[PDB]
């Protein structure tokens, strides 16, 4: 439906109201060390900044 | 003068060298066609006077 | 009722708009479409006749 | 609808007749001053297409969610999408008639539903402000929308190809020549050439005045008085 | 009721504003939008006819 | 109805009399300046055919389904169909009188049924807008239609053939010469020639003023006041 | 939206044609006068962007407690924070569109709540005075506030890069050239060049007058008379 | 907010282009005429800051018992106290913004209690007369008082440092150059230079007229009519 | 004169040295293109007169 | 009430393709209906996809 | 929405042209292996 | 008859309403491999992009 407060502002507000849940997810990612799997070196280079441990499936 | 433009005289040589020295401007802008011709026409008195001085 | 248009004021199709009721556009440099474009009327009866 | 090749020849015989770069056959312009002349024709058409309403064109602008400012440039179009300077294309043009970045003034914009939206109306929700002539600021990008934007247009830019056709009324070619002559003769900075530039420029106004004094460029406008019935007035 | 706009006073969209009720902006150098922009009216009946 | 060959001779005796390219018999123009003179006559007729209504011609435009914009060029005609730049022909011309791409201003267009359709009327379904002088935008291409488009016309382009006949009133030939003289004498950029160009150009207006001050070009118009009976007024 | 590289070329063919620094190909400007020309274009755009309302931009200004005077410079912005001359940043700009220090006149400022605050109103609490054109004096920095400041803007400063794009209407390029010609030709202090500078400067006004006599720069304004219903007047 | 170093360069390219002291790189001014140019910029800003209200500043003046005449010089301030010419300091300025002796006209002075005191009112106890523009004569130095004196201001004096920033509207830089050109070219006493000085000076008025004809220097003023409710008029 | 600009004569040498002495200004500002050409054109009388004096 | 100018703006020159399709909706429907009858030979790459055919396959030609 | 319908048709213009050409190019080989049903083929069926 | 919504717009809409059927036809052409008959090489060169298998009747 066509929102009165603006179509994109509704999306922005919806994301805003869910920041707390996203804050919990970000915290759990940041504090608990994570090991992830990667196909190649290019994808490994393209990892996020909180990824401490990785595994390259050759 | 050989009574022909670009002849084998002294008046012709001087009068066809001044025009060949002004056409270097006219063909590179810096003057319109009208200005070039006026300069060329007002040179005949000078060229004729200096051609006789050179010849004799 | 004999309108007299000045020669040059209303161009082509700008006099056809005029003679049809539609709003027209006139050349300002020719004059004024209230003192030119004369609408001839009945003359004024001289007081002498009455 | 003449061609740029023909414009070169007609310019070489009437306006730029005493010019230096006129070739020996007198019916063409040498290849060293052609960039100069082409840069004068392009400016000449721009001025002529600015005073008179000569080319009225409309280009529809689709709504992309999250974008309110809608510049009407050619980098945002579909057939000329430039991924380096535009995130997504939102204008719509066909391959035969691509957007030519030729907006001088925006006149009247409709919608996808047929509702006319006012322009530059401070107190008017449903109004598309233009913060700069070649932009558009719709404050509510509703779903499934578009905007047929009727705008004054200029002649598409003359790249330099001698086969590009020129859209000018035949009666206004005696004014384009008198403006090329002005631009050319005024740059030589000589007393003789400068005095000729003024004559050519003043003749440009005289011809541009006779075109507007005879409605040869479609300047006069008449419309039905639809306001009458709306305000009451039985 | 045949308004006669001078040729040059009201530009494009400044006559569309005029023919819609909205306030317009006119070029001063052309004239005055009270003596130009003539609103033609009925002629004045000559006293001679009456 | 004179010929271009005769115009060359009459130009060589009155206007371009001191011109360089005048041949030794004084009754013709040399073959090196003829492109120049021909490019001045063509512009001369265009100006004369623009101010005065000298040639009023109508060319019917058939409706092709799916096409609303109808440019009145010669590439879309029947006898001059150009398959490279036109998908289908829709104008109609006979072999003896082909379309000559000579539209200056469109004045009045009727239909195949006899119904007059207004021009440039924003609030008027059944109205043919012209988005540019030599175009036509019918918004409803109905079945079995056509459009007799009465338009102001210019003289057909003079290719250069010395047997092409010129359509000018005999009283206006003293103004065509005074415009060729203006165009020619103003390009030499010399003080003597420039001062003569102004005299020839001003004489062009004087003769073009005497032609309009005596109705020699059919400029004055009178019509029956059909509006009277329609608005009531018994 | 042309580029500074193209402006150099178009300047070299029309206005600065007889200038000394014109290179041998005639289509560019030598690397010794480019600082001079660039310093003339920058002034040229500033004048053109001052008369006409060509670029209307708004930059929001967050409230920092304890600060009432809020200069709208670029040193106080977020993306261009200068810790040496600004204690804290309070303007807000995105990386793609940073603040360009381009405020000529401040026109209308709203709030974070939607309440319009008057400008330069002596008897008006809730009024933002401007003690100097590029400043702002809010007398009550309330909590959680901001100010969308609609202001007249100038073209962002042309550093000198030949790939920076210029925001000027296509119809006003014939006036920017006539102002560069004025500035250049008036500095030579020669009688011939000075007399040409006056002609180029006067032509600047003539073109800047035709742009305002045809509403090509969006100068005419019409608004709904909202005052009517407020003052009573049923 | 440009710098004096940049002003030197922009002056060297537009106004003082034919000047002798222009260095070989053409983008700077030699070290022998810089005192001269700096003495012209300082006068230039003073004139521009005098006509237009460009810098409105207020400096509070504490009351010292026994002193009625309160000159607003910099020797009496706090941060610039000069014990040799001032017995005690009574103006108040912060180290970051010291008093710059830049009072042109005093406009409106309030008190420490909020009571506005009239200026130059013969019959008005509670009135601060100014016996000379940069002074103040309070006739009753009450206890615990101060005076926020809103005054027209000039640009702080340019000492000569090439890192001092100049507070001028961007639209008025084309008038500061035309005044430096006037002052410089009028001192040479040569016929050619004098005639150029008049042109530069007259252009100063023309630009200073376009700035006031478009409200680019905030000259137009509107205020709420608070007088209405006070005089009765329910 | 060799009837060509920048030739191997005396008229050409003098007339192509005066232009090479005025182009030093034109290429450094201080004169527009139009002023330079006018100066160059008004030198032909002087150069032709002085070339004959030098040659003979 | 006529939306034809929109078609001219968007599908102007290539409207012939749309008209040719429109004149042939019946022929296209008949073609599809005959196509569903599988009365033809179908090309298949390798034996593997031969099994992957409709219960109504009537001929097949395997390449490789 | 006239624009939606026109755009939906236009974006599928190439596929429409392909289908129309395939209908005109119609030359699919039909397997009969019997003269009776081969004689009972439609008029447009070439190649068997 | 003369349509009010435009003569060509009626055709465009009629084609639009039948896109689903055309979608089924296009899908059946695309997924099920097709072998077609061709007279010469020029006609073979003029085949569509989903024609994988062909047969040139010489």
Author numbering:
A (entry chain D), L (entry chain D): 30 to 87
B (entry chain C), I (entry chain C): 57 to 112
C (entry chain A), E (entry chain A): 407 to 456
D (entry chain B), F (entry chain B), G (entry chain B), H (entry chain B): 1 to 234
J (entry chain E): 24 to 87
K (entry chain F): 36 to 83
The authors write:
We isolated and characterized two Shigella podophages that have notably different features when compared with classical podophages and instead are most closely related to phage N4. We describe the isolation and characterization of phages Moo19 and B2, including whole-genome sequencing and analysis, cryo–electron microscopy (cryo-EM) structure determination, mass spectrometry, host range studies, and enzymatic assays of the tail proteins. Our work shows that these phages have divergent decoration proteins and unique tail structures, and encode and package their own phage-dependent RNA polymerase, and the tails, which display esterase activity, are dependent on specific O-antigen modifications of lipopolysaccharide (LPS) for entry. Moo19 and B2 are similar to bacteriophage N4—these are all T = 9 podophages, which encapsidate their own polymerases—a hallmark of this phage family.
We were able to clearly model several proteins with our C12-symmetrized maps including most residues for the portal proteins, tail adaptor proteins, and tail tubes for both Moo19 and B2. In addition, we were able to model the N-terminal residues of the tailspike proteins for both Moo19 and B2 but not the full-length proteins using the cryo-EM data as these are likely highly flexible at the linkage site. The portal shown in red was modeled from residues 17 to 675 of 760 total for Moo19 and residues 182 to 679 of 706 total for B2. The adaptor proteins were largely complete with all 234 residues modeled for Moo19 and residues 2 to 233 of 234 total for B2. Last, the tail tube shown in blue was modeled for residues 4 to 278 of 279 for Moo19 and residues 3 to 200 of 206 for B2. The tail tube of Moo19 (gp71) and the tail tube of B2 (gp34) both share a high sequence homology (>80%) with a number of phages that infect enteric hosts such as Shigella, Salmonella, Escherichia, Klebsiella, etc. In addition, Moo19 and B2 have C12 symmetry and not the proposed C15 symmetry of DEV. Some critical features differed between the two structures. Moo19 has an extra side appendage (composed of gp81, which is observed in the mass spectrometry data shown in Table 1). In G7C, this appendage is hypothesized to expand the host range; however, Moo19 and B2 have the same host range, so the function of gp81 in Moo19 is unclear at this time. Three major structural differences (see cartoon representation in Fig. 3B) include (i) the lack of the tail appendage, (ii) a single tailspike for Moo19 and a complex of two proteins for B2 (see next two paragraphs), and (iii) the completely different decoration proteins.
